[model samples]
Target: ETLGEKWKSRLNALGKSEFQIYKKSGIQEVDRTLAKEGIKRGETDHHAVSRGSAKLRWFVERNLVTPEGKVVDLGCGRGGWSYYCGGLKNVREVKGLTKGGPGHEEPIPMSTYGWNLVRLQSGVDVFFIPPERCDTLLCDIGESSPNPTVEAGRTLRVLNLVENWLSNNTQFCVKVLNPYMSSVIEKMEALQRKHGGALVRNPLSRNSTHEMYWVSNASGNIVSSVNMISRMLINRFTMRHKKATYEPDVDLGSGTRNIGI
Candidate 1:
Protein backbone atom coordinates (compact mmCIF):
# COMPACT_ATOMS: atom_id res chain seq x y z
CA GLU A 1 0.00 0.00 0.00
CA THR A 2 2.91 2.36 0.58
CA LEU A 3 3.84 2.25 -3.13
CA GLY A 4 6.07 5.24 -3.96
CA GLU A 5 6.06 6.44 -0.37
CA LYS A 6 7.84 3.25 0.58
CA TRP A 7 10.93 4.11 -1.43
CA LYS A 8 10.74 7.77 -0.36
CA SER A 9 10.76 7.03 3.34
CA ARG A 10 13.41 4.34 2.98
CA LEU A 11 15.65 6.67 1.04
CA ASN A 12 15.04 9.36 3.66
CA ALA A 13 16.42 7.09 6.34
CA LEU A 14 20.09 8.14 6.38
CA GLY A 15 21.33 4.60 6.96
CA LYS A 16 19.42 2.85 4.22
CA SER A 17 19.62 5.54 1.54
CA GLU A 18 23.38 5.22 1.10
CA PHE A 19 23.92 1.73 2.44
CA GLN A 20 23.73 -0.09 -0.86
CA ILE A 21 26.75 1.69 -2.22
CA TYR A 22 28.48 2.32 1.07
CA LYS A 23 28.49 -1.39 1.74
CA LYS A 24 30.59 -1.71 -1.42
CA SER A 25 28.58 -4.76 -2.34
CA GLY A 26 29.79 -4.39 -5.92
CA ILE A 27 33.44 -5.19 -5.26
CA GLN A 28 33.19 -8.74 -6.53
CA GLU A 29 32.18 -7.56 -9.97
CA VAL A 30 34.36 -4.50 -9.82
CA ASP A 31 37.39 -6.69 -9.38
CA ARG A 32 36.19 -8.88 -12.19
CA THR A 33 35.79 -5.83 -14.39
CA LEU A 34 39.27 -4.68 -13.43
CA ALA A 35 40.77 -7.98 -14.54
CA LYS A 36 38.66 -7.93 -17.70
CA GLU A 37 40.07 -4.53 -18.57
CA GLY A 38 43.58 -5.64 -17.60
CA ILE A 39 43.97 -2.60 -15.37
CA LYS A 40 45.08 -2.29 -11.79
CA ARG A 41 42.59 -0.95 -9.29
CA GLY A 42 45.00 1.59 -7.84
CA GLU A 43 44.84 3.79 -10.94
CA THR A 44 41.11 4.45 -10.70
CA ASP A 45 38.93 6.39 -8.31
CA HIS A 46 37.72 3.88 -5.71
CA HIS A 47 34.72 5.86 -4.51
CA ALA A 48 33.81 6.79 -8.05
CA VAL A 49 33.59 3.11 -8.83
CA SER A 50 30.89 2.85 -6.19
CA ARG A 51 29.18 6.13 -6.92
CA GLY A 52 25.66 5.53 -8.19
CA SER A 53 26.33 1.78 -8.03
CA ALA A 54 23.24 1.27 -5.90
CA LYS A 55 20.96 3.02 -8.38
CA LEU A 56 22.32 1.04 -11.28
CA ARG A 57 21.86 -2.17 -9.35
CA TRP A 58 18.26 -1.15 -8.68
CA PHE A 59 17.80 -0.64 -12.41
CA VAL A 60 18.91 -4.19 -13.01
CA GLU A 61 16.72 -5.46 -10.17
CA ARG A 62 13.68 -3.73 -11.74
CA ASN A 63 14.52 -5.20 -15.15
CA LEU A 64 14.85 -1.76 -16.70
CA VAL A 65 17.84 -3.39 -18.42
CA THR A 66 17.64 -6.95 -19.61
CA PRO A 67 19.96 -9.61 -20.93
CA GLU A 68 21.54 -8.83 -24.31
CA GLY A 69 19.99 -5.35 -24.21
CA LYS A 70 21.71 -2.20 -25.43
CA VAL A 71 22.22 0.80 -23.12
CA VAL A 72 23.45 4.33 -23.62
CA ASP A 73 24.72 6.50 -20.79
CA LEU A 74 24.19 10.04 -21.91
CA GLY A 75 26.21 12.52 -19.89
CA CYS A 76 27.65 9.75 -17.80
CA GLY A 77 29.40 11.10 -14.72
CA ARG A 78 32.11 8.92 -13.17
CA GLY A 79 30.95 6.00 -15.31
CA GLY A 80 29.90 3.95 -12.29
CA TRP A 81 26.75 2.76 -14.02
CA SER A 82 28.50 2.45 -17.32
CA TYR A 83 31.27 0.16 -16.08
CA TYR A 84 28.97 -1.88 -13.87
CA CYS A 85 26.42 -2.39 -16.62
CA GLY A 86 29.09 -3.09 -19.20
CA GLY A 87 30.45 -5.82 -17.00
CA LEU A 88 26.92 -7.03 -16.44
CA LYS A 89 26.29 -10.75 -16.38
CA ASN A 90 23.79 -10.78 -19.25
CA VAL A 91 26.29 -9.64 -21.89
CA ARG A 92 24.58 -6.27 -22.41
CA GLU A 93 26.21 -3.77 -24.74
CA VAL A 94 26.99 -0.34 -23.34
CA LYS A 95 27.94 2.99 -24.89
CA GLY A 96 28.78 6.05 -22.78
CA LEU A 97 29.47 9.63 -23.83
CA THR A 98 30.17 12.92 -22.15
CA LYS A 99 30.00 16.62 -23.07
CA GLY A 100 33.70 17.32 -23.01
CA GLY A 101 36.37 14.65 -22.51
CA PRO A 102 37.07 11.40 -20.78
CA GLY A 103 38.32 12.84 -17.53
CA HIS A 104 36.45 11.01 -14.81
CA GLU A 105 35.33 7.94 -16.73
CA GLU A 106 35.77 4.55 -15.07
CA PRO A 107 38.22 2.00 -16.43
CA ILE A 108 36.08 0.08 -18.88
CA PRO A 109 36.56 -3.15 -20.76
CA MET A 110 37.39 -3.00 -24.45
CA SER A 111 33.87 -4.24 -25.07
CA THR A 112 32.31 -1.08 -23.66
CA TYR A 113 33.04 1.96 -25.83
CA GLY A 114 33.51 5.44 -24.37
CA TRP A 115 32.94 8.54 -26.47
CA ASN A 116 34.35 11.94 -25.71
CA LEU A 117 33.36 15.37 -27.08
CA VAL A 118 29.78 14.24 -27.28
CA ARG A 119 26.53 15.61 -25.83
CA LEU A 120 23.34 17.50 -26.75
CA GLN A 121 25.33 20.71 -27.24
CA SER A 122 26.75 18.94 -30.30
CA GLY A 123 23.41 19.86 -31.92
CA VAL A 124 20.65 17.27 -32.01
CA ASP A 125 20.54 17.10 -35.80
CA VAL A 126 24.17 16.08 -36.18
CA PHE A 127 24.31 13.79 -33.18
CA PHE A 128 25.93 10.60 -34.46
CA ILE A 129 24.63 7.29 -33.16
CA PRO A 130 23.76 3.88 -34.52
CA PRO A 131 20.34 3.70 -36.16
CA GLU A 132 19.40 0.80 -33.91
CA ARG A 133 17.84 2.45 -30.85
CA CYS A 134 18.95 1.55 -27.33
CA ASP A 135 16.86 -0.45 -24.88
CA THR A 136 17.47 2.10 -22.08
CA LEU A 137 18.80 5.60 -21.70
CA LEU A 138 20.39 6.89 -18.47
CA CYS A 139 20.71 10.62 -17.92
CA ASP A 140 21.52 12.42 -14.66
CA ILE A 141 22.16 16.15 -14.50
CA GLY A 142 20.21 16.68 -11.31
CA GLU A 143 23.00 15.92 -8.88
CA SER A 144 25.03 19.07 -9.38
CA SER A 145 22.70 21.66 -10.90
CA PRO A 146 22.92 24.92 -8.99
CA ASN A 147 19.21 25.51 -9.45
CA PRO A 148 16.12 23.87 -10.86
CA THR A 149 15.83 26.27 -13.81
CA VAL A 150 19.07 25.13 -15.41
CA GLU A 151 18.24 21.51 -14.60
CA ALA A 152 14.81 21.86 -16.16
CA GLY A 153 16.22 23.54 -19.24
CA ARG A 154 18.71 20.73 -19.82
CA THR A 155 16.20 17.99 -19.05
CA LEU A 156 13.59 19.40 -21.46
CA ARG A 157 16.12 19.60 -24.28
CA VAL A 158 17.30 16.07 -23.60
CA LEU A 159 13.79 14.87 -24.36
CA ASN A 160 14.04 16.42 -27.81
CA LEU A 161 17.22 14.44 -28.34
CA VAL A 162 15.49 11.38 -26.90
CA GLU A 163 13.10 11.50 -29.82
CA ASN A 164 15.95 10.55 -32.12
CA TRP A 165 17.52 7.95 -29.84
CA LEU A 166 14.51 6.08 -28.44
CA SER A 167 12.07 3.55 -29.83
CA ASN A 168 8.62 3.01 -28.35
CA ASN A 169 10.06 0.26 -26.14
CA THR A 170 12.96 2.20 -24.72
CA GLN A 171 12.95 2.65 -20.94
CA PHE A 172 14.11 6.12 -19.92
CA CYS A 173 15.60 6.87 -16.49
CA VAL A 174 16.17 10.56 -15.96
CA LYS A 175 17.29 12.43 -12.82
CA VAL A 176 16.50 16.01 -11.96
CA LEU A 177 16.96 18.40 -9.03
CA ASN A 178 14.05 19.81 -6.99
CA PRO A 179 11.35 19.46 -9.65
CA TYR A 180 8.69 22.21 -9.82
CA MET A 181 5.03 22.31 -10.82
CA SER A 182 4.14 22.24 -14.52
CA SER A 183 7.78 21.57 -15.12
CA VAL A 184 10.05 18.59 -15.68
CA ILE A 185 8.20 15.60 -14.26
CA GLU A 186 4.73 16.65 -15.54
CA LYS A 187 5.92 17.25 -19.08
CA MET A 188 8.29 14.29 -18.96
CA GLU A 189 5.50 11.95 -17.86
CA ALA A 190 3.26 13.30 -20.62
CA LEU A 191 5.99 12.66 -23.17
CA GLN A 192 6.55 9.09 -21.94
CA ARG A 193 2.85 8.22 -22.26
CA LYS A 194 2.96 9.54 -25.80
CA HIS A 195 5.95 7.27 -26.35
CA GLY A 196 3.78 4.23 -25.50
CA GLY A 197 5.16 4.13 -21.95
CA ALA A 198 4.22 5.38 -18.49
CA LEU A 199 6.58 7.08 -16.06
CA VAL A 200 7.07 5.96 -12.43
CA ARG A 201 8.47 8.79 -10.38
CA ASN A 202 11.28 8.14 -7.91
CA PRO A 203 11.10 4.47 -8.52
CA LEU A 204 14.49 4.19 -6.80
CA SER A 205 16.39 7.17 -5.51
CA ARG A 206 18.62 8.20 -2.57
CA ASN A 207 17.37 10.63 0.05
CA SER A 208 20.83 12.10 0.53
CA THR A 209 20.47 14.36 -2.49
CA HIS A 210 17.99 16.96 -3.76
CA GLU A 211 17.55 14.75 -6.80
CA MET A 212 14.55 12.79 -8.06
CA TYR A 213 14.24 10.08 -10.69
CA TRP A 214 11.60 9.12 -13.26
CA VAL A 215 11.60 5.59 -14.65
CA SER A 216 9.27 4.12 -17.26
CA ASN A 217 8.28 0.54 -17.86
CA ALA A 218 11.08 -1.19 -19.71
CA SER A 219 8.93 -3.18 -22.12
CA GLY A 220 6.53 -0.30 -22.79
CA ASN A 221 2.76 -0.91 -23.22
CA ILE A 222 3.08 -4.62 -22.58
CA VAL A 223 4.34 -4.03 -19.04
CA SER A 224 1.92 -1.16 -18.55
CA SER A 225 -0.98 -3.56 -19.26
CA VAL A 226 -0.16 -7.23 -19.67
CA ASN A 227 2.31 -7.30 -16.80
CA MET A 228 -0.48 -6.92 -14.25
CA ILE A 229 -2.52 -9.53 -16.06
CA SER A 230 0.36 -11.96 -15.95
CA ARG A 231 0.88 -11.29 -12.25
CA MET A 232 -2.80 -11.80 -11.52
CA LEU A 233 -2.77 -15.10 -13.29
CA ILE A 234 0.21 -16.21 -11.22
CA ASN A 235 -1.53 -15.04 -8.06
CA ARG A 236 -4.56 -17.06 -9.13
CA PHE A 237 -2.41 -20.17 -9.26
CA THR A 238 -0.58 -19.43 -5.98
CA MET A 239 -3.59 -18.29 -3.94
CA ARG A 240 -4.58 -21.96 -3.75
CA HIS A 241 -1.18 -22.74 -2.17
CA LYS A 242 0.80 -21.01 0.56
CA LYS A 243 4.31 -22.16 -0.35
CA ALA A 244 6.24 -20.84 -3.39
CA THR A 245 4.13 -17.70 -3.60
CA TYR A 246 5.46 -14.66 -5.44
CA GLU A 247 6.33 -12.33 -2.61
CA PRO A 248 8.21 -9.78 -4.76
CA ASP A 249 6.15 -7.10 -6.52
CA VAL A 250 6.64 -4.04 -8.67
CA ASP A 251 5.23 -0.55 -8.03
CA LEU A 252 4.28 1.30 -11.20
CA GLY A 253 2.53 4.30 -9.64
CA SER A 254 3.55 7.96 -9.65
CA GLY A 255 3.58 9.83 -6.35
CA THR A 256 3.40 13.22 -4.61
CA ARG A 257 5.53 11.93 -1.74
CA ASN A 258 8.49 13.99 -2.90
CA ILE A 259 6.53 17.07 -4.05
CA GLY A 260 6.76 18.96 -0.76
CA ILE A 261 10.49 18.40 -0.56
Candidate 2:
Protein backbone atom coordinates (compact mmCIF):
# COMPACT_ATOMS: atom_id res chain seq x y z
CA GLU A 1 0.00 0.00 0.00
CA THR A 2 2.81 2.36 0.83
CA LEU A 3 4.95 1.53 -2.22
CA GLY A 4 4.20 4.83 -3.92
CA GLU A 5 4.55 6.65 -0.60
CA LYS A 6 8.08 5.39 -0.14
CA TRP A 7 8.96 6.25 -3.70
CA LYS A 8 7.11 9.54 -3.55
CA SER A 9 9.02 10.66 -0.49
CA ARG A 10 12.26 9.59 -2.09
CA LEU A 11 11.23 11.32 -5.30
CA ASN A 12 10.15 14.50 -3.51
CA ALA A 13 13.30 14.84 -1.42
CA LEU A 14 15.61 15.58 -4.30
CA GLY A 15 15.82 18.74 -6.42
CA LYS A 16 14.11 18.52 -9.81
CA SER A 17 16.94 17.08 -11.85
CA GLU A 18 18.13 14.90 -8.99
CA PHE A 19 14.61 13.60 -8.50
CA GLN A 20 14.46 12.64 -12.16
CA ILE A 21 17.68 10.71 -11.70
CA TYR A 22 16.31 8.97 -8.66
CA LYS A 23 13.03 8.30 -10.48
CA LYS A 24 14.80 6.56 -13.32
CA SER A 25 17.02 4.45 -11.10
CA GLY A 26 14.24 3.51 -8.74
CA ILE A 27 11.92 2.81 -11.67
CA GLN A 28 14.27 0.12 -12.90
CA GLU A 29 13.63 -1.99 -9.84
CA VAL A 30 10.00 -0.98 -9.67
CA ASP A 31 9.40 -1.74 -13.34
CA ARG A 32 10.69 -5.28 -13.10
CA THR A 33 9.00 -5.88 -9.78
CA LEU A 34 5.76 -4.30 -10.99
CA ALA A 35 5.92 -6.11 -14.29
CA LYS A 36 6.03 -9.40 -12.42
CA GLU A 37 2.71 -8.41 -10.91
CA GLY A 38 1.55 -5.80 -13.48
CA ILE A 39 1.92 -2.06 -12.78
CA LYS A 40 3.10 1.24 -14.29
CA ARG A 41 5.03 4.15 -12.81
CA GLY A 42 2.19 6.40 -11.51
CA GLU A 43 3.72 9.84 -11.17
CA THR A 44 4.57 8.87 -14.72
CA ASP A 45 1.54 6.74 -15.47
CA HIS A 46 -1.40 7.81 -13.29
CA HIS A 47 -2.88 10.45 -15.54
CA ALA A 48 -1.11 8.35 -18.09
CA VAL A 49 -4.16 6.39 -19.14
CA SER A 50 -5.75 9.69 -18.32
CA ARG A 51 -3.13 11.81 -20.04
CA GLY A 52 -1.50 8.79 -21.51
CA SER A 53 -3.12 6.04 -23.56
CA ALA A 54 -6.90 6.05 -23.14
CA LYS A 55 -7.30 8.73 -25.73
CA LEU A 56 -5.35 6.73 -28.22
CA ARG A 57 -8.00 4.04 -28.20
CA TRP A 58 -10.44 6.53 -29.66
CA PHE A 59 -8.10 7.19 -32.57
CA VAL A 60 -6.89 3.63 -32.77
CA GLU A 61 -10.34 2.09 -32.67
CA ARG A 62 -11.44 4.25 -35.54
CA ASN A 63 -8.61 2.92 -37.71
CA LEU A 64 -7.08 6.39 -37.73
CA VAL A 65 -3.69 4.80 -37.06
CA THR A 66 -2.47 3.64 -40.43
CA PRO A 67 0.88 2.67 -41.95
CA GLU A 68 1.44 6.22 -43.13
CA GLY A 69 1.57 7.47 -39.56
CA LYS A 70 4.61 8.30 -37.50
CA VAL A 71 4.47 8.34 -33.72
CA VAL A 72 6.53 10.43 -31.34
CA ASP A 73 6.50 9.81 -27.59
CA LEU A 74 8.13 12.76 -25.95
CA GLY A 75 9.68 12.61 -22.49
CA CYS A 76 9.50 8.87 -22.90
CA GLY A 77 9.89 7.98 -19.23
CA ARG A 78 10.57 4.31 -18.63
CA GLY A 79 9.63 3.86 -22.32
CA GLY A 80 6.30 2.22 -21.55
CA TRP A 81 4.28 4.42 -23.88
CA SER A 82 7.05 4.29 -26.43
CA TYR A 83 7.05 0.53 -26.37
CA TYR A 84 3.28 0.20 -26.70
CA CYS A 85 2.74 3.00 -29.21
CA GLY A 86 5.67 1.79 -31.24
CA GLY A 87 4.08 -1.64 -31.35
CA LEU A 88 1.23 -0.41 -33.47
CA LYS A 89 1.87 -2.20 -36.74
CA ASN A 90 0.17 0.54 -38.67
CA VAL A 91 2.64 3.19 -37.63
CA ARG A 92 5.48 3.75 -40.07
CA GLU A 93 7.89 4.83 -37.35
CA VAL A 94 8.02 5.53 -33.65
CA LYS A 95 10.39 8.18 -32.35
CA GLY A 96 10.74 8.24 -28.60
CA LEU A 97 12.53 11.40 -27.44
CA THR A 98 13.52 12.04 -23.86
CA LYS A 99 14.93 14.68 -21.56
CA GLY A 100 16.84 11.84 -19.91
CA GLY A 101 16.67 9.04 -17.31
CA PRO A 102 15.42 5.37 -17.07
CA GLY A 103 14.53 4.73 -20.72
CA HIS A 104 17.83 5.18 -22.50
CA GLU A 105 18.02 1.42 -22.88
CA GLU A 106 14.30 0.86 -23.38
CA PRO A 107 13.12 -0.06 -26.88
CA ILE A 108 12.59 3.56 -27.90
CA PRO A 109 13.95 3.95 -31.43
CA MET A 110 15.05 7.56 -30.95
CA SER A 111 16.58 9.56 -28.13
CA THR A 112 18.67 12.75 -27.49
CA TYR A 113 19.49 14.78 -30.59
CA GLY A 114 23.26 14.40 -30.88
CA TRP A 115 24.17 15.31 -27.26
CA ASN A 116 21.34 17.61 -26.15
CA LEU A 117 18.51 16.21 -23.98
CA VAL A 118 14.90 17.42 -24.27
CA ARG A 119 14.93 19.53 -21.07
CA LEU A 120 18.20 20.93 -22.32
CA GLN A 121 16.54 21.71 -25.64
CA SER A 122 13.57 21.15 -27.94
CA GLY A 123 13.27 20.90 -31.75
CA VAL A 124 14.07 17.41 -32.94
CA ASP A 125 15.14 16.92 -36.53
CA VAL A 126 12.56 14.17 -36.84
CA PHE A 127 9.83 16.72 -36.44
CA PHE A 128 11.62 18.39 -39.29
CA ILE A 129 10.84 15.36 -41.36
CA PRO A 130 8.13 16.43 -43.72
CA PRO A 131 4.84 15.91 -41.94
CA GLU A 132 3.47 14.99 -45.34
CA ARG A 133 5.92 12.16 -45.69
CA CYS A 134 4.66 10.78 -42.45
CA ASP A 135 1.13 11.31 -43.78
CA THR A 136 -0.23 11.60 -40.22
CA LEU A 137 1.82 11.92 -37.07
CA LEU A 138 0.67 10.93 -33.59
CA CYS A 139 2.64 12.11 -30.60
CA ASP A 140 2.46 12.27 -26.80
CA ILE A 141 4.91 13.06 -23.98
CA GLY A 142 4.41 12.31 -20.25
CA GLU A 143 7.50 13.46 -18.38
CA SER A 144 6.15 16.46 -16.50
CA SER A 145 8.60 16.96 -13.68
CA PRO A 146 8.09 19.44 -10.81
CA ASN A 147 9.05 22.55 -12.74
CA PRO A 148 6.14 24.36 -14.35
CA THR A 149 8.46 26.72 -16.23
CA VAL A 150 10.25 23.88 -17.97
CA GLU A 151 7.03 21.99 -18.62
CA ALA A 152 5.57 25.20 -20.00
CA GLY A 153 8.52 25.57 -22.35
CA ARG A 154 8.04 22.07 -23.65
CA THR A 155 4.33 22.67 -24.12
CA LEU A 156 5.11 25.83 -26.05
CA ARG A 157 7.42 23.97 -28.32
CA VAL A 158 4.88 21.22 -28.87
CA LEU A 159 2.30 23.78 -29.93
CA ASN A 160 4.82 25.25 -32.30
CA LEU A 161 5.75 21.77 -33.44
CA VAL A 162 2.13 21.14 -34.31
CA GLU A 163 2.04 24.38 -36.21
CA ASN A 164 5.24 23.95 -38.21
CA TRP A 165 6.18 20.29 -38.08
CA LEU A 166 3.09 18.12 -37.94
CA SER A 167 0.71 19.08 -40.72
CA ASN A 168 -2.93 20.01 -40.15
CA ASN A 169 -4.17 16.43 -39.92
CA THR A 170 -2.33 15.14 -36.90
CA GLN A 171 -3.28 13.39 -33.67
CA PHE A 172 -1.37 13.68 -30.43
CA CYS A 173 -1.52 13.51 -26.63
CA VAL A 174 0.42 15.52 -24.05
CA LYS A 175 0.22 16.04 -20.27
CA VAL A 176 0.86 19.50 -18.86
CA LEU A 177 0.44 20.49 -15.22
CA ASN A 178 -0.70 23.84 -13.83
CA PRO A 179 -0.63 26.81 -13.05
CA TYR A 180 0.60 27.41 -16.62
CA MET A 181 -1.86 24.86 -17.92
CA SER A 182 -4.78 27.27 -17.64
CA SER A 183 -3.50 29.25 -20.62
CA VAL A 184 -1.66 26.32 -22.13
CA ILE A 185 -4.76 24.29 -22.97
CA GLU A 186 -6.20 27.30 -24.74
CA LYS A 187 -3.09 27.51 -26.87
CA MET A 188 -3.54 23.85 -27.68
CA GLU A 189 -7.25 24.31 -28.40
CA ALA A 190 -6.19 27.21 -30.56
CA LEU A 191 -3.85 24.84 -32.34
CA GLN A 192 -6.71 22.44 -32.79
CA ARG A 193 -8.72 25.22 -34.38
CA LYS A 194 -5.80 26.23 -36.54
CA HIS A 195 -5.58 22.69 -37.82
CA GLY A 196 -9.35 22.29 -37.92
CA GLY A 197 -9.00 19.28 -35.67
CA ALA A 198 -11.09 18.51 -32.61
CA LEU A 199 -9.41 18.94 -29.25
CA VAL A 200 -10.28 17.24 -25.99
CA ARG A 201 -8.84 18.68 -22.81
CA ASN A 202 -9.13 16.57 -19.70
CA PRO A 203 -8.18 18.67 -16.69
CA LEU A 204 -9.99 16.23 -14.50
CA SER A 205 -7.06 14.00 -13.69
CA ARG A 206 -5.86 14.10 -10.11
CA ASN A 207 -2.56 15.70 -9.08
CA SER A 208 -3.30 18.78 -11.20
CA THR A 209 -2.63 16.66 -14.24
CA HIS A 210 -4.27 17.59 -17.54
CA GLU A 211 -4.20 15.69 -20.82
CA MET A 212 -4.96 16.89 -24.34
CA TYR A 213 -5.89 14.80 -27.34
CA TRP A 214 -6.61 15.78 -30.92
CA VAL A 215 -9.06 13.72 -32.91
CA SER A 216 -9.66 14.04 -36.66
CA ASN A 217 -13.42 13.61 -36.68
CA ALA A 218 -14.47 17.07 -37.78
CA SER A 219 -18.27 16.79 -37.57
CA GLY A 220 -19.01 17.26 -33.88
CA ASN A 221 -15.64 16.65 -32.32
CA ILE A 222 -15.45 20.18 -31.03
CA VAL A 223 -13.28 21.58 -28.24
CA SER A 224 -14.42 20.06 -24.97
CA SER A 225 -13.69 19.21 -21.36
CA VAL A 226 -15.02 15.97 -19.89
CA ASN A 227 -17.17 15.96 -16.77
CA MET A 228 -14.60 15.05 -14.13
CA ILE A 229 -16.82 12.51 -12.44
CA SER A 230 -17.85 10.59 -15.56
CA ARG A 231 -14.36 10.71 -16.99
CA MET A 232 -13.01 9.34 -13.73
CA LEU A 233 -15.77 6.82 -13.40
CA ILE A 234 -15.30 5.56 -16.94
CA ASN A 235 -11.52 5.60 -16.76
CA ARG A 236 -11.65 3.79 -13.45
CA PHE A 237 -13.21 0.83 -15.20
CA THR A 238 -10.82 1.00 -18.14
CA MET A 239 -7.92 1.08 -15.73
CA ARG A 240 -9.15 -1.64 -13.42
CA HIS A 241 -7.95 -4.53 -15.53
CA LYS A 242 -4.98 -2.58 -16.81
CA LYS A 243 -4.14 -0.89 -13.53
CA ALA A 244 -0.70 -1.72 -12.34
CA THR A 245 -0.81 -3.81 -9.18
CA TYR A 246 1.23 -1.24 -7.28
CA GLU A 247 -0.60 1.02 -4.86
CA PRO A 248 0.88 3.71 -2.62
CA ASP A 249 -0.35 3.93 0.95
CA VAL A 250 0.82 4.67 4.50
CA ASP A 251 1.79 1.08 5.09
CA LEU A 252 3.69 0.22 1.89
CA GLY A 253 6.24 2.98 2.46
CA SER A 254 7.29 0.55 5.16
CA GLY A 255 6.10 2.73 8.07
CA THR A 256 3.31 4.81 9.59
CA ARG A 257 2.49 8.47 8.94
CA ASN A 258 3.11 10.38 12.15
CA ILE A 259 4.47 13.68 10.92
CA GLY A 260 3.21 17.23 11.41
CA ILE A 261 -0.38 17.99 10.52
Highest TM-score among the candidates is held by which one?
A: 1
Residue 200 lDDT, candidate 1, scale 0-100: 34
Model 2 compared with the native: what TM-score? 0.46
Residue pairs that clash (backbone atoms under 3 angstroms), model 1 = none
Across residues 137-159, which tens digit of lDDT does each residue of candidate 2 receive?
44554336555446656767666
**lDDT tens readout by residue for model 1, 41-78:** 44332222333555566666776544236777765654
Tell me model 1's lDDT, rounded to 2 decimals.
Answer: 0.44
Residue 240 of model 2 has an lDDT of: 23
lDDT of 2 at 200: 48
The C-alpha RMSD of each candidate to the native structure, in angstroms, is 13.8, 15.0
| Model 2 global lDDT (CA atoms, 0 to 1) | 0.40
Cα lDDT, model 1, residue 225: 34
